[PDB]
Design a protein around this ligand. Structure first.
Ligand code: SPL
Ligand code: SPL
Ligand SMILES: *[C@@H]1O[C@H](CO)[C@@H](O[C@@H]2O[C@H](CO)[C@@H](O)[C@H](O)[C@H]2NC(C)=O)[C@H](O)[C@H]1NC(C)=O
Ligand SMILES: *[C@@H]1O[C@H](CO)[C@@H](O[C@@H]2O[C@H](CO)[C@@H](O)[C@H](O)[C@H]2NC(C)=O)[C@H](O)[C@H]1NC(C)=O
Ligand SMILES: *[C@@H]1O[C@H](CO)[C@@H](O[C@@H]2O[C@H](CO)[C@@H](O)[C@H](O)[C@H]2NC(C)=O)[C@H](O)[C@H]1NC(C)=O
Ligand SMILES: *[C@@H]1O[C@H](CO)[C@@H](O[C@@H]2O[C@H](CO)[C@@H](O)[C@H](O)[C@H]2NC(C)=O)[C@H](O)[C@H]1NC(C)=O
Ligand code: CLR
Ligand code: CLR
Ligand code: CLR
Ligand code: CLR
Ligand code: CLR
Ligand code: CLR
Ligand code: CLR
Ligand code: CLR
Ligand code: CLR
Ligand code: CLR
Ligand code: CLR
Ligand code: CLR
Ligand code: CLR
Ligand code: OLA
Ligand code: OLA
Ligand code: NAG
Ligand code: NAG
Ligand code: NAG
Ligand code: NAG
Ligand code: CA
Ligand code: CA
Ligand code: ZN
Ligand code: ZN
Lengths: 647, 647
């Protein structure tokens, strides 16, 4: 079959609209011709319109270049998720460019476009081929564009000579439709279709925000393609059946803006590390200075098993989580799927094989303060033993160990946060609290009852509350039932505890009940995403509130408080308020899909390195340390009464 | 541009080879024509050869049907992983069929093939289009075929009326190349390329074996496509770069055989469940009968804290693993990626949202036997307390709790086994052993030393042995160093323990050292994949070995053993041998890639439901139960000596 393409190949012109009709006995061929100069990249874009009546007889389009062939049909057809189909009547595509070097010299390029159909009567089509003026992207310069499920887009970026790492930030003013942003290398072909985009490069699903960090050394040639693909449905991104506007003919157009910004320098790393270390070594320095001053001025003028048990439990609880997080990080590094970890992508600063180094270095406070508390408790125990030759020193040892373990477990969790890791850190605290409660109750012994066995019943209630939360997740009225039950249990347990230990008593009981009701109302306002964390927070706040009555009662002229006690109380209150402010700034969440979580990301404020969550870590560590110090040294004035004062 | 395809469209014939030459001013068009009858499926396959000299100027091939257009180029080009390129000079493709219904009636089908090129002089090509005689697959009938990286294959299967679930088994006689097997629905297009195969259906990577289970209710129309795609490199499947053969003329041909077999019926489920329950309720029945007989015949003629602590630790260790495994199972169900869990796919029988129901139901023995042991220990404790108004009853309570928790954790791990889960079950036993050892040493008190503090040093050594194993994985000489160090530590610890508690003493010490050296030699033969499990096994065998000397020494006429002791010991030896046989049959492994693990799968033997691993679970549970019973009731003759006999 001898056929000459040039016989009917109408030499066509760019930026010109060609209308036509084709059927079984007709085929249309257009020949486009251009030249590529050195040190310049030219991209060609093809556009085809066809009406909708061509359903059983679409129009087939073929594009031929020297080393590639591309093809498709109009109208494009998409399959839904529940047996639904969509059809699009406008298709566009960018042909993979081929740069020309100075050594190569200017290159002549030829392109062929063939339009055909098997319609019995005739199919109408419109065609338009153009060049792309804005194809290469610049640093720090925002660029706007529009994409469609049948008109994917992609652009080229070249690494500047000096820059070593960059961040791509993509922003839209509305979700629905939700799209995919991908980064790939220069070699053709470019995968820009729904079924092959997630195959080669690094990709993120997005609705309003996206941010990708890239390093130069991973890209031969120091350049890359950025591809944007829209999806036919919003199911994957937390959406229901695709939203259709009144105007829309089917089309889901998405307006996007993209920026590329250079990343920070290592000097920031050094400054942040030094600041983090010193801000907490200041505590050790101040304690040493105070001790030295006291020695210069004032001086001149049984639990071992209960410690080693905790050590063993901590170590053999910590190891497996470390291994699991290591596996998660390795998988995320290798596969390139950035929808596994719920980072705050706008302030995730990598180091080595670590994706978010700041989120882990922000946990030094827990470890250091726990170690300092353990040192203080050990010093007090040694002094007491020496003086004898102060009863629950094992409790304070457990407190310090729990603080250190919480720091370590949070550091492990932040390696790759998702909907599988919070439970470990949540549950270790429950285990420690249960062990401490059992030890305290056994040591105190029943004697009279003792009390009314309220603590064990409360701990059980917590047990099956957590079990139910694991079983039913936001299930109809079970959510409300469990919420109300837990709040009522907390209220009545607090009432019993206060009563078992006089108008002041009634006043305090009423205040506690009112505070519990306020907690219940706050929980009613915002639904609690996680039951265990909610219960832990309620328990902690109730503990501080009970300590509030204890201190107030002790301050009824019956006894006195030394400067260290009330200094610690004021510090604890101020730090608790400060940390509670940051506790409510959520930059991510595993409750929803990765795109919904990414919608909440934020840039970080302190020294260009730390976001809200790091500040929360610091403040929580400090507040817990000062609360523990208040608990330990509350009773010192009573030491005035000698002959075996209160233990 | 008016072009008439029929003017040069040479009406071509099937099963005929057409040779041709094309260049810039020439294009070849062939028209194929056929008819499709109702209740019959016809598939067309296209073949193109082109010599390798066409590197800069390949031959472009386009295939046009009524509602689809397909295109490609020859020679096909593949990009390697380390900047390597491959080219294939023979390409074949199957065109998506369109079934004809009786209501629709026979339909005439037309097809167009266009061959073009831009070579300045000319490019040679050979073309051949055929029908597929063997396209539909039959039940229980094996089918052989061959595939290539540039010649993917796929076939159609229709669900028989009676069958409700099927299994696809694919077998090859040699790995390298490694391929992907996918199952998709009827609706076209069919994704059979390297970059879009893993997008729609359910897929598995394979080298020698593959097995996929499917249920009818998930497929509208009760039919599906099975697709086989070969890969250009073996990196993903544990191999190196493309291994070139004498024939490789680049081509990596893979011969495959495929079978489709119906799945088992629910009667097997019922039988297996009933057998599993009754085989272990027999123990309860026998114990009850023996107790009743003894009562009829013979009769006629402090730890609470140590128990509740263990309960709390167990519960708050177990919960997070349950949540994690639930998440894993949900992800595997949704995504369809069957390379996440290392099941034994040849005997994985689903139920509900459970992929391998048998592997979990095979863990009833641990739970039931642990509960029975706890009941026995509680009965003995109650009897002793009543008689007083037997010193380490807390140890036996911990033993029973550990057995039950091991059963539960194994059940949790088998939901989705991979390289992230063994650590939890391995570490819980370490924690329990450490707690028990510490409590025993504290209760025994130092008195004289006590002993030489060897146990604590050994436990510490285990600590950093596990830490090093986590740090260095098969790292040069570190593997051998750690292996030898652990073996020497075990040997010298056993020597010290035996010496601290007379030629029999030296005889036993020499025997123990020889056994430890035998263990070291066995470890030398086969490299240990996991350090923690290896150490746990060594410790367990050393414990049984020590119990062996203890019983033998007691049997030197110094004391006597009642029938229950020696019956239990014989049962323990028999069951240990039986279970140790099955322990060495590994049907899967997470050390290598999923394909390598799948190479080891096996069908299951007992009642068509249980493989080797289930038998191992049963036997290990029984052996551990009988060993614990031997330990508890070893010292009963010493009861003859009254006035506070040995506790
Ligand atoms: C009973 C004897 C002593 C037991 C000591 C161990 C148990 C008490 C808690 C110890 C400290 C663990 C950290 C607590 C809370 C936070 O870190 C986390 C937030 O990630 N959970 C949260 O829920 C956030 C904190 C909520 C704060 C509420 C308002 C103060
Ligand atoms: C010290 C006082 C009593 C402490 C009681 C708790 C600690 C001892 C072990 C308790 C039973 C746990 C089960 C042990 C082993 C096996 O289940 C697993 C196999 O998956 N590990 C394996 O390594 C396989 C078993 C290896 C067997 C070696 C040959 C007998
Ligand atoms: C639709 O197909 C019909 C026949 O299959 C075409 O009819 C002839 O097409 C040739 C090719 O252009 C013309 O030279 C003849 O003049 C046509 N016949 C008549 C009676 O007009 C028809 O041209 C096709 N449609 C279009 C738009 O070309
Ligand atoms: C294809 O259809 C689209 C939409 O119907 C056309 O887009 C219009 O283009 C004109 C300029 O010629 C604009 O003034 C309109 O606002 C556009 N409509 C939109 C964006 O909805 C397009 O011109 C048609 N032709 C081709 C070759 O694509
Ligand atoms: C390769 O291209 C050349 C020119 O571009 C072709 O030369 C002419 O091709 C036409 C097409 O059939 C013939 O009618 C002429 O007779 C050819 N010229 C001569 C001098 O023979 C050439 O045919 C192309 N290659 C092939 C195999 O057709
Ligand atoms: C393309 O090349 C292949 C291999 O070079 C050809 O396959 C041969 O086919 C003949 C039958 O015509 C067999 O006798 C040979 O054994 C095959 N060689 C193999 C399998 O290596 C094929 O015929 C060529 N032609 C086409 C159209 O594919
Ligand atoms: C190759 C480039 C990125 C190197 C730039 C220097 C960076 C990576 C170095 C400079 C100082 C270093 C820190 C110095 C001290 C500490 C405290 C220690 O407890 C953990 C490591 C940590 C936090 C180091 C992390 C890495 C660090 C921040
Ligand atoms: C035996 C008992 C009384 C010991 C009590 C612990 C004492 C030494 C602790 C409790 C609270 C501590 C202080 C808490 C906070 C700060 C602020 C810091 O910028 C300097 C150190 C300084 C001022 C600490 C010094 C040591 C301190 C006073
Ligand atoms: C009590 C004190 C000493 C505990 C200190 C624990 C610190 C050193 C541990 C806890 C969790 C650890 C991280 C866990 C996982 C990974 C991922 C791996 O790919 C690189 C190392 C990295 C990032 C670890 C670095 C060290 C780490 C932060
Ligand atoms: C003692 C402790 C460890 C026991 C814990 C048992 C819990 C975790 C078990 C018991 C029954 C289980 C449920 C049984 C059935 C279903 C329905 C299924 O569609 C989803 C899983 C779900 C909801 C299971 C989740 C886990 C579950 C709630
Ligand atoms: C939301 C889930 C996932 C985790 C967090 C739950 C817990 C920790 C939250 C939810 C309800 C919260 C409390 C609601 C109301 C009050 C009263 C206010 O005057 C101080 C803060 C305080 C005391 C909050 C502290 C934090 C809290 C206890
Ligand atoms: C230990 C506690 C009770 C001491 C007092 C803490 C007080 C001051 C805390 C608890 C709840 C906190 C508020 C919680 C939420 C908001 C809304 C936010 O848009 C601004 C901060 C603001 C307004 C916080 C300010 C500080 C706050 C009022
Ligand atoms: C809808 C089809 C698949 C139903 C077929 C019946 C199957 C699913 C039924 C029949 C008997 C059932 C078993 C009966 C008793 C037990 C013991 C219990 O401790 C766990 C559940 C378990 C193991 C059941 C699992 C489900 C089971 C095996
Ligand atoms: C108070 C002390 C001495 C009680 C010791 C426990 C006794 C009752 C236990 C120890 C070993 C047990 C036996 C172990 C195995 C079997 C085989 C089974 O097919 C029937 C029950 C039978 C025969 C058990 C009966 C109960 C048994 C004899
Ligand atoms: C001490 C005894 C009572 C403990 C019994 C534990 C049993 C009931 C628990 C332990 C682990 C659990 C499984 C863990 C995870 C899943 C996956 C989920 O999608 C369906 C339920 C299923 C398959 C659970 C079924 C119930 C289960 C097997
Ligand atoms: C809410 C949704 C978006 C959360 C998504 C979490 C899913 C995708 C995560 C959670 C656990 C992850 C798996 C954890 C471990 C393995 C085993 C490894 O050999 C390959 C990766 C693989 C298989 C991971 C793939 C991604 C994974 C399945
Ligand atoms: C007290 C216990 C919990 C401390 C455990 C610390 C362990 C887990 C930490 C300390 C130092 C860490 C290593 C530091 C550096 C590297 C090199 C990197 O390429 C892979 C991770 C690896 C190999 C880390 C693995 C985890 C590690 C070994
Ligand atoms: C291999 C890793 C992953 C887990 C298994 C390691 C442990 C449990 C293995 C490795 C070495 C093994 C031992 C090697 C040699 C002997 C001596 C033989 O007469 C009885 C079995 C016995 C006593 C084996 C028992 C199981 C064992 C202790
Ligand atoms: C508690 C122990 C020491 C009691 C004695 C157990 C003996 C009989 C066990 C330990 C190691 C076992 C062997 C381990 C490996 C093999 C190779 C396999 O192809 C056939 C079974 C065979 C040959 C096993 C037979 C049983 C065996 C010899
Ligand atoms: C409780 C957490 C306390 C965190 C203390 C400081 C954390 C240090 C973390 C690791 C630093 C080194 C490992 C990071 C990547 C190593 C690769 C490399 O440095 O080349
Ligand atoms: C230690 C493990 C002991 C195992 C005991 C028996 C295991 C029973 C497991 C669950 C049975 C029901 C849950 C399985 C899928 C539920 C969905 C359904 O049945 O419809
Ligand atoms: C493309 O344009 C150049 C510019 O004149 C011309 O030399 C060349 O012949 C054209 N290509 C074809 C195929 O005509
Ligand atoms: C190629 O040569 C031209 C000729 O001056 C030069 O301007 C250009 O910089 C060269 N290309 C590169 C990458 O240096
Ligand atoms: C295809 O073959 C049938 C069989 O006779 C014929 O009627 C029909 O016209 C053919 N199609 C074309 C396009 O020639
Ligand atoms: C279609 O009709 C023919 C005519 O007898 C019949 O044989 C065939 O079974 C029908 N198809 C189906 C799916 O029943
Ligand atoms: Ca590419
Ligand atoms: Ca399909
Ligand atoms: Zn955090
Ligand atoms: Zn197992």
């Amino acid at each position: 079959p001898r056929r000459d393409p040039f016989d009917a190949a109408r030499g066509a012109d760019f930026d010109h609209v060609y209308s036509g009709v084709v059927n079984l006995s007709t085929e249309n061929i257009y020949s486009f011709n251009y030249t590529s100069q050195p040190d310049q990249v030219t991209a060609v874009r093809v556009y085809v319109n066809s009406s909708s009546e061509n359903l059983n007889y679409p129009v087939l389009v073929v594009v031929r270049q020297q080393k590639e062939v591309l093809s498709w049909q109009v109208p494009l057809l998409f399959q839904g998720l529940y047996q639904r189909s969509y059809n699009y009547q406008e298709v566009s595509r960018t042909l993979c460019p081929s740069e020309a070097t100075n050594e190569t010299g200017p290159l002549q390029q030829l392109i062929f476009v063939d339009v055909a159909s098997m319609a019995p009567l005739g199919a109408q089509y419109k065609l338009l081929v153009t060049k792309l003026k804005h194809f290469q992207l610049r640093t720090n310069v925002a660029f706007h564009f529009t994409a469609s499920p049948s008109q994917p887009q992609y652009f080229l970026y070249k690494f500047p000579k000096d820059v070593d790492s960059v961040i791509i930030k993509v922003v839209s003013e509305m979700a629905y439709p939700c799209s995919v942003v991908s980064v790939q290398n220069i070699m053709c072909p470019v995968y820009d279709l729904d079924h092959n985009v997630e195959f080669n490069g690094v990709y993120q699903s997005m609705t309003k925000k996206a941010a990708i960090t890239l390093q130069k050394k991973d890209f031969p040639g120091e350049q890359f393609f950025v591809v944007f693909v829209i999806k036919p449905e919003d199911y994957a991104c937390g959406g229901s059946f695709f939203i259709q506007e009144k105007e829309n003919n089917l089309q889901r157009k998405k307006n996007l803006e993209v920026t590329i910004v250079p990343s920070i320098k290592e000097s920031v790393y050094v400054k942040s590390s030094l600041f983090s270390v010193f801000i907490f070594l200041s505590f050790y320095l101040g304690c040493l200075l105070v001790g030295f001053v006291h020695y210069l001025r004032f001086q001149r003028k049984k639990y071992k098993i209960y410690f080693w048990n905790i050590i063993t439990i901590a170590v053999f609880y910590a190891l497996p989580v470390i291994q699991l997080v290591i596996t998660y990080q390795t998988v995320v590094n290798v596969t390139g799927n950035q929808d596994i970890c719920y980072y705050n992508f706008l302030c995730a600063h990598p180091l080595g094989v670590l994706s978010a180094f700041n989120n882990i270095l922000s946990n030094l406070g827990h470890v250091l303060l726990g170690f300092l508390f353990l040192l203080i408790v050990l010093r007090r125990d040694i002094l007491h033993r020496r003086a004898l030759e102060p009863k629950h020193f094992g409790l304070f040892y457990a407190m310090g160990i729990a603080l250190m373990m919480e720091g370590v477990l949070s550091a492990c969790y932040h390696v790759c946060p998702n909907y599988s890791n919070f439970q470990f850190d949540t549950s270790f605290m429950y285990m420690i609290a249960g062990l401490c409660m059992l030890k305290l109750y056994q040591t105190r012994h029943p004697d009279i009852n003792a009390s009314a066995y309220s603590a064990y019943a409360s701990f059980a209630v917590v047990i099956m509350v957590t079990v139910l939360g694991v079983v039913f997740g936001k299930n109809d009225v079970w959510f409300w039932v469990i919420f109300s039950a837990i709040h009522v249990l907390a209220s009545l347990a607090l009432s019993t505890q206060i009563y078992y230990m006089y108008m002041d008593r009634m006043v305090l009981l009423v205040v506690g009940n009112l505070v519990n009701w306020s907690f219940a109302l706050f929980g009613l306002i915002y639904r609690p995403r996680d039951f265990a964390s909610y219960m832990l927070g309620i328990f902690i706040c109730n503990l501080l509130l009970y300590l509030a009555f204890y201190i107030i009662m002790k301050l009824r002229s019956s006894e006195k408080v030394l400067p260290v006690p009330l200094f610690c109380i004021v510090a604890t209150a101020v730090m608790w308020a400060a940390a509670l402010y940051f506790f409510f700034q959520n930059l991510s969440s595993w409750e929803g899909t990765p795109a919904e979580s990414r919608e909440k990301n934020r840039e970080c404020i302190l020294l260009d390195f730390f976001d809200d969550h790091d500040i929360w870590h610091f403040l929580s560590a400090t507040a817990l340390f000062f609360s523990f110090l208040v608990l330990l040294t509350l009773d010192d004035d009573l030491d005035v009464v000698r002959r075996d004062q209160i233990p």
